[PDB]
Amino acid sequence: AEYFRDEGRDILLFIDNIFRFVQAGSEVSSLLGRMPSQVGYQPTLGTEMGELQERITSTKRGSITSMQAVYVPADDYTDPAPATVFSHLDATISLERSIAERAIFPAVDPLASTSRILDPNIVGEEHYRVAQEVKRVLQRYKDLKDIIAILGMEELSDEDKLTVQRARKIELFFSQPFTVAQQFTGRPGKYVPVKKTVESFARLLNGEGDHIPESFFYMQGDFDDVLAAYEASQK
Amino acid sequence: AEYFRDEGRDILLFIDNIFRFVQAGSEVSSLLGRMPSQVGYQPTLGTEMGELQERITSTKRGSITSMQAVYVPADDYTDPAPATVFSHLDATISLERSIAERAIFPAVDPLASTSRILDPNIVGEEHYRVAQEVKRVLQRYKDLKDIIAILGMEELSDEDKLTVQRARKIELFFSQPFTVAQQFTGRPGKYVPVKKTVESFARLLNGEGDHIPESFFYMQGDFDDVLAAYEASQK
Amino acid sequence: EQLANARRDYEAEIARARQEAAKIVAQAQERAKQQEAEIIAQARREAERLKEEAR
Amino acid sequence: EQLANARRDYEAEIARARQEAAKIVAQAQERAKQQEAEIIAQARREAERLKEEAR
Amino acid sequence: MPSSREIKRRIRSVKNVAQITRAMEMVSASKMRRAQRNVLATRPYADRM
Amino acid sequence: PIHLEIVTAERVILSDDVDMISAPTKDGRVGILPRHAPLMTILEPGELDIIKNGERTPFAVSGGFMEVLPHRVTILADTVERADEIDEARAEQARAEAEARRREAQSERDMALAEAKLRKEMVRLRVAQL
Amino acid sequence: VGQGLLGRVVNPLGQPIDGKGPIVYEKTRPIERIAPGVITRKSVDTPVQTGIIAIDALIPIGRGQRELIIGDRQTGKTAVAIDTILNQKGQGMVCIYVAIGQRRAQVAQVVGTLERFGAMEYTIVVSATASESAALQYIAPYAGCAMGEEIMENGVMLNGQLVKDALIVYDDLSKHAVAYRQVSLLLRRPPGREAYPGDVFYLHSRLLERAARLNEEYGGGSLTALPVIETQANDVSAYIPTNVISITDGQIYLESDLFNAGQRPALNVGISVSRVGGAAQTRAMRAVAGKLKGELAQFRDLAAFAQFASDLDATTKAQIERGQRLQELLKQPQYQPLPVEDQVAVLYAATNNYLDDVPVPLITKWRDDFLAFLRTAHPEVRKLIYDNRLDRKFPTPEVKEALEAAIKEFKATSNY
Amino acid sequence: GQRPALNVGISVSRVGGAAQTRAMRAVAGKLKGELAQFRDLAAFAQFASDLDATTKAQIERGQRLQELLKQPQYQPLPVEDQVAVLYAATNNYLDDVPVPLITK
Numbered sequence A, B: 001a002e003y004f005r006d007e008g009r010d011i012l013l014f015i016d017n018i019f020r021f022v023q024a025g026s027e028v029s030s031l032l033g034r035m036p037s038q039v040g041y042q043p044t045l046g047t048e049m050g051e052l053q054e055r056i057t058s059t060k061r062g063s064i065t066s067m068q069a070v071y072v073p074a075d076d077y078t079d080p081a082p083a084t085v086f087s088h089l090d091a092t093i094s095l096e097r098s099i100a101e102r103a104i105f106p107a108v109d110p111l112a113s114t115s116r117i118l119d120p121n122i123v124g125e126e127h128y129r130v131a132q133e134v135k136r137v138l139q140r141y142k143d144l145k146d147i148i149a150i151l152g153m154e155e156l157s158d159e160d161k162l163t164v165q166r167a168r169k170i171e172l173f174f175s176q177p178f179t180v181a182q183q184f185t186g187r188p189g190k191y192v193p194v195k196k197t198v199e200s201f202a203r204l205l206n207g208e209g210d211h212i213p214e215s216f217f218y219m220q221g222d223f224d225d226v227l228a229a230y231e232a233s234q235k
Numbered sequence C, D: 001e002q003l004a005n006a007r008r009d010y011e012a013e014i015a016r017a018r019q020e021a022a023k024i025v026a027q028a029q030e031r032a033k034q035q036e037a038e039i040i041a042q043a044r045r046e047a048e049r050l051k052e053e054a055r
Numbered sequence E: 001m002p003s004s005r006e007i008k009r010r011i012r013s014v015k016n017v018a019q020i021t022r023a024m025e026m027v028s029a030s031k032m033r034r035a036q037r038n039v040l041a042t043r044p045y046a047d048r049m
Numbered sequence F: 001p002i003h004l005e006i007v008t009a010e011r012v013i014l015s016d017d018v019d020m021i022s023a024p025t026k027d028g029r030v031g032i033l034p035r036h037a038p039l040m041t042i043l044e045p046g047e048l049d050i051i052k053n054g055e056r057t058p059f060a061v062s063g064g065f066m067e068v069l070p071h072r073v074t075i076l077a078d079t080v081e082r083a084d085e086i087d088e089a090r091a092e093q094a095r096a097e098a099e100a101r102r103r104e105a106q107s108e109r110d111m112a113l114a115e116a117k118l119r120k121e122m123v124r125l126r127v128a129q130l
Numbered sequence G: 001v002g003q004g005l006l007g008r009v010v011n012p013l014g015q016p017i018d019g020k021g022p023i024v025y026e027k028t029r030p031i032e033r034i035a036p037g038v039i040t041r042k043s044v045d046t047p048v049q050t051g052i053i054a055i056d057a058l059i060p061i062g063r064g065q066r067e068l069i070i071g072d073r074q075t076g077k078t079a080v081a082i083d084t085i086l087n088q089k090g091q092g093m094v095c096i097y098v099a100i101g102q103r104r105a106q107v108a109q110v111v112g113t114l115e116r117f118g119a120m121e122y123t124i125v126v127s128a129t130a131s132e133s134a135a136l137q138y139i140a141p142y143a144g145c146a147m148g149e150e151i152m153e154n155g156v157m158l159n160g161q162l163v164k165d166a167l168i169v170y171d172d173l174s175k176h177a178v179a180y181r182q183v184s185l186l187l188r189r190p191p192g193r194e195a196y197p198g199d200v201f202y203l204h205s206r207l208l209e210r211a212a213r214l215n216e217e218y219g220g221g222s223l224t225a226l227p228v229i230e231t232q233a234n235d236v237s238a239y240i241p242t243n244v245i246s247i248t249d250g251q252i253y254l255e256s257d258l259f260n261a262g263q264r265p266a267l268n269v270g271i272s273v274s275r276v277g278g279a280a281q282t283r284a285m286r287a288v289a290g291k292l293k294g295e296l297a298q299f300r301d302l303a304a305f306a307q308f309a310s311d312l313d314a315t316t317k318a319q320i321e322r323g324q325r326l327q328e329l330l331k332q333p334q335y336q337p338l339p340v341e342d343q344v345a346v347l348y349a350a351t352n353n354y355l356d357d358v359p360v361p362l363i364t365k366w367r368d369d370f371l372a373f374l375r376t377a378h379p380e381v382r383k384l385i386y387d388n389r390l391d392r393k394f395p396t397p398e399v400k401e402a403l404e405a406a407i408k409e410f411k412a413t414s415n416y
Numbered sequence H: 001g002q003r004p005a006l007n008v009g010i011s012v013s014r015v016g017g018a019a020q021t022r023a024m025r026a027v028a029g030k031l032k033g034e035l036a037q038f039r040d041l042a043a044f045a046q047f048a049s050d051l052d053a054t055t056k057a058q059i060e061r062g063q064r065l066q067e068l069l070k071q072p073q074y075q076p077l078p079v080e081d082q083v084a085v086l087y088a089a090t091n092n093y094l095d096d097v098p099v100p101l102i103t104k
């Protein structure tokens, strides 16, 4: 990838499992007779991670963005392999099996996915207001979900029923069909830009979507596909 | 014992402790300078245990049939000493201190005491039925005793009184005075044939013992001994 | 009129039930014959395969 | 009462027809299975004796 | 560090506690709804009286 | 044209328009018509009949009260059972349903809640250190 | 390797230990070889019918898929493997059983169970028992998979048909790893975590990556691996369990809590996965078991309310009762696999509103009786279900109406 | 407050009654059984207060017996004193004196 980086291109390296890279390093160190460190890991875990993920930088000539997949042993985020991986991470995208069981293919947990670039002065002033308010609304829904499941939405007051409605709308609205991969729920290609995401979520966050039922937001587009489907079905 | 096995006789072998055998193997390996395995144990633990256990088999000529005591420290069945023997067992008798302190000196827990030979095709259909139903009523009593700890038995019971009484009677009836236990108690020992014990538990399982109180089932042989004690008291 | 229609409906329903019972029994006999024939044919084919593999 | 009796008798007649259908189909299945078992046993024995003869 | 086994046993016990309390909360909500229905059914008689 | 509000301390029995009603009053049976004067009534155990448009439904009451207003009549009765039903006196289905209503259901509730509390306490004190 | 090893119990060196004469053969395959590779393989499409309703409906296993069976002590891992082997009676698949580090009596009982059900007509039983040296236990699974790769690449004449599909069960990879750890430590090789050598992930991986599903260019055969791992107090995060879990495509978790609770296959549906998924299932099972998976997930979400269902509202009690009936349906007796048509019919009866009338403790009996009904009163329904099991829209009106008629006829003439 | 700090539940003496005088064997079997019952159903003793008559009686007898076992340092009891005290406790002669006086 560094060849194409040297041409000024923006490469996006993908890594299938950086934890298996860690395990390969640990096995190599054990086979060489070196003394184990931390949780039976190699002594050179930090340097071995550095020699790989310090070549993934934004050079003045070109850039290599990377996306690793990390296996967390025993769901222990303090384990030395995730601990050393997290030291080099700029963003995290947490997938949950619970979201997957609800037939949400991009099962990204917005309350567990973070990014260091989520700042007002880098990604946009409206970005770090729309994302912040979407996360706040989803956190409110996570707080109220147990009450809703136990009691029901009738006990919820105003400013909470609307918040739960908007939260369900955005939670179902985060789903994409991935029509590029195979043709499952195929539709015309969209590739929703960052600005379009910001505008759509600012639109829904400012109302303008309450008349839409909480079933249209599924494998949709940029909230203009949502209103187009709403007009097509019954309007 | 292999000489008596080779003579055609069915020989009996009692290994009074297994974890001490594992400890001796671990000490021997540590003293010889072998590389430690697992938590400081011997690398040849499985091989040593197999070398010991695989000579205890039923052959065409004779058969060595064995009982081996294993002491589990606390309740740890994952220690190397009981873990390396589990693969070589046909039946496990789980002794409990709680049952022993309840004066049930043959402190076998009927639950968590399994056997590969407990099959209707081998021990007969009546034996399997009686054992399975006894385990079922004891399992029901395991919850009903908790239930009656706060809500008295007379307060409410839908056949719970009868099954609690039967389960108490059978868990007392599992207790048997031993020939070698005369020193501890003074009660003469009792020997029950395998047919007589299953017949007695079948008789006690469905009626015929609901009038005898839970005091004549304490230290007896078959159900005939319980009866003889009852009509000896009522003279 | 309701009594007359009820008696007529009872007779019509029992006649239709008899007809459907006869049809069901006939279809069952046909299915039984077909299944027995196919089982015998499968057994004969397996026997021939055993002959060939034994040779 | 006549309507209830008509419905009940129709359902009972259909159920009895299906019971007879099941009985005859099961009888034919058992006969075919035992005939197949006889054929297979004969084929196995003849294969064994042919193997001995060629041996 | 007491032990991995002991802390795992404590985790299992507290998880069982959480499940039991969740079931208790659910049945208490159901009983509260039934009691509210009973109160609303009794209320017209009390109002007339 | 008077709506009969037969209401019991546990539940409302009837809230329909009734054109003719009797009343087992302690000083003689009284028949109330939709124009009747205001009245207060104490009912001994008797048999109230609802005759809405010639209904003639017997309705056994075991005492209570009756308030008659010029446009409505309310019966505040203690305990009531329908006299005719299908079976004699109380129906067999009513007793079968009420047999599992406060006996089976209450016993199951008590057993389940008790056993949940006991399991919670048993797995509670074994935790030792939080 | 070849046809001569069929019904023979052999050493890891290939020498027979069944006492039935010398092994007849003309070709020897090396113990260690590279996996088929990148372009050699093909996407897993053909299903492996284990006969267990829960496995065949929720955790599909396909030909060429490495599906780990991971459990603890006595949870039925060998029972599941033997049930899978017994279900290949006429499925055109050759089974191999390795049994690393077991008893001689246990392997003898397994062989007796196989030969009393006719399974030895297509089964190879490698055997490296506990008393045998650690070298034999170390080379046993590689001998088994060498035989399996002979079946995959060339095939053998089974029932007069060429068979190129092999199902191999490494009945204890934990014991194999223990034996290799003993070998390495006795060679004074540097230990790692839990005193296992550095090349212990490599160890199993060479073994497991040889199980492939080849394309039509390379023969089209397949080798299906069923490794077995024994945990200690359900320690899934141990070294060898994590190694085999990462290597294998899917996992089948067996829990002692479910085993002692009456669940005859002690299968934990919630945590067990098969990442091949619906591609390793027939179209009939794909169409039927989706609602079963959804209802079981809903029940597992509400499992804490099971004893309190009498005090909840209508829909939650209905979900709890449906989940209880489905869980009782998945209970299966030992050595009784079910064909795909029987599983599809039973799961169609359960998925639709037909088991609501019959009470929970009788569900299993109902299933058995229904199968007997379909085995006696309606063979045509079973043949119809088996015939169009590959149809994309499986519930065609013909088979749908036939199955509904069979279910109604069984329910009307039976009482529970 | 359990000054000897004996954990009787897990403490074991494999010799058992053979290492006791016959008086102590006579007066200790009921003590051991009652203490075992108290250790069993002592979970319902911190906050569960209703219980029934039998469970409350067993808990309270166990509490009295445990309070009986507390000893000050350097104050050994002769075997006759121990068997007399255990005979008093095991024959319901202490059922009226309250718990926070038993040692006294």
Ligand SMILES: Nc1ncnc2c1ncn2[C@@H]1O[C@H](COP(=O)(O)OP(=O)(O)OP(=O)(O)O)[C@@H](O)[C@H]1O
Pocket (backbone or CB within 6 Å): B086, B087, B116, G071, G072, G073, G074, G075, G076, G077, G078, G079, G080, G230, G264, G265, G332, G333, G334
């Ligand atoms: N589905 C089942 N229904 C009923 N009993 C079963 C079932 N599966 C297994 N068993 C019983 O449980 C016993 C233990 O199962 P099995 O030997 O297969 O377990 P395992 O995990 O291989 O154990 P091991 O560590 O002893 O090798 C079997 O011998 C059998 O008696």
Ligand SMILES: [Mg+2]
Pocket (backbone or CB within 6 Å): G077, G078
């Ligand atoms: Mg096994």
